[PDB]
């Protein structure tokens, strides 16, 4: 799509994942997290540990990747790879011996 | 020193076909978009396309098989085209440089517009 | 797209009084409102974008105010030089242009 292929080119031209993706920095950024469970893959009586398949929907706007629609054809959503955008870096406080943040960078619906 | 100035027939039969060039000088084809904008007589304005800096086009869904444009980056050039006129389409043609932020764009300059009437 | 309304459709000022123009969206515009002036037979020129920024060169007079679905053109000083027709126009969500708020001097 030469549409979203223009799209994607312009939006990370000089997009910062650094800062946070507020307009002002005074503005807080509102982070939607809903968990979902998969399977419990395990519960470890012995070590007191549980294994858990999960999904963790995180959904929060980025000021500076709004599009208008009919520049691109009327692409009105993208997937993006995650690594390219700014994140929240949820951990999970009581991990035991997993990895505390997310290490599956699967692709972002914007 | 930003300018774009529109040329074309000012009268066009119906069912015939219109070509418009604007003229462009104090900046390169090749780092601005260039918006093609008609004012319908009794209307507001309305977006018919756009010439990207990459040189792609987007045209307005109600138009996109209706019209075709292209560019000479050489002569600093923007050539509308558009095909199967009806007596609608008489109004003032403006082409336009677009600003950008990020990918959000808009019309920071307009051409002095050409008057384009349809009738036989 | 999102449709939009101008208020006055005509207004008649005297040069020097301060005049609001209003803009209102049929969503929510975003603050992605800009402001053009347009002179019988000349070029349209940008005033105001992002609904508070200035065109480089506008004089000061101009400013631009609102937020949601509504929005403001203000001229603090109504020159005689801006004597004109003034259309706001949105470009978050498509293009679409107001009717144009045509202003002339009070006689």
């Known amino acids: 799509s030469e549409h979203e292929t223009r799209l994607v080119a312009k939006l990370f031209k000089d997009y910062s994942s650094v800062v946070r993706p507020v307009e002002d920095h005074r503005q807080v950024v509102e982070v939607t997290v809903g968990l979902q469970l998969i399977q419990l893959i395990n519960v470890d009586e012995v070590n007191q540990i549980v294994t858990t398949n999960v999904r963790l929907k995180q959904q929060w706007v980025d000021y500076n990747l709004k599009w208008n629609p009919d520049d691109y054809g009327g692409v009105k959503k993208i997937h993006i790879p995650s690594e390219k955008i700014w994140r929240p870096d949820l951990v999970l406080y009581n991990n035991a011996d997993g990895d505390f943040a997310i290490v599956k960078f699967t692709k972002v619906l914007l | 020193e930003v300018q774009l100035q529109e040329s074309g027939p000012g009268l066009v039969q119906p069912s015939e076909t219109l070509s418009l060039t604007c003229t462009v000088s104090?900046?390169?084809?090749?780092?601005?978009?260039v918006s093609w904008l008609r004012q319908p007589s009794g209307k507001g304005p309305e977006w018919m396309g756009r010439?990207?800096?990459?040189?792609?086009?987007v045209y307005n869904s109600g138009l996109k098989s209706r019209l075709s444009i292209s560019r000479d980056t050489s002569k600093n050039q923007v050539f509308l085209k558009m095909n199967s006129l009806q007596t609608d389409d008489t109004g003032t043609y403006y082409c336009?440089?677009?600003?950008?932020?990020?990918?959000?764009?808009?019309?920071?300059?307009w051409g002095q517009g050409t008057l384009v009437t349809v009738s036989s | 797209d999102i449709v939009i309304t101008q208020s006055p459709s005509l207004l008649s000022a005297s040069v020097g009084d301060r005049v609001t123009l209003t803009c209102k969206g049929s969503?929510?515009?975003?603050?992605?409102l800009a402001w053009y002036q347009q002179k019988l037979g000349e070029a349209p020129k940008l005033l105001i974008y992002?609904?508070?920024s200035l065109q480089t060169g506008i004089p000061s007079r101009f400013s631009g105010s609102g937020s949601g679905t509504d929005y403001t053109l203000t001229i603090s000083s109504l020159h005689s030089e801006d004597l004109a027709t003034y259309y706001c126009?949105?470009?978050?969500?498509?293009?679409?242009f107001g009717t144009g708020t045509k202003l002339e001097l009070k006689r």
């Open positions: 336009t440089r677009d600003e950008r932020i990020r990918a959000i764009n808009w019309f920071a300059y």
């Open positions: 104090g900046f390169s084809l090749t780092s601005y978009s």
């Open positions: 010439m990207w800096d990459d040189g792609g086009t």
């Open positions: 969503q929510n515009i975003d603050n992605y």
């Open positions: 992002k609904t508070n």
């Open positions: 126009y949105q470009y978050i969500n498509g293009y679409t």
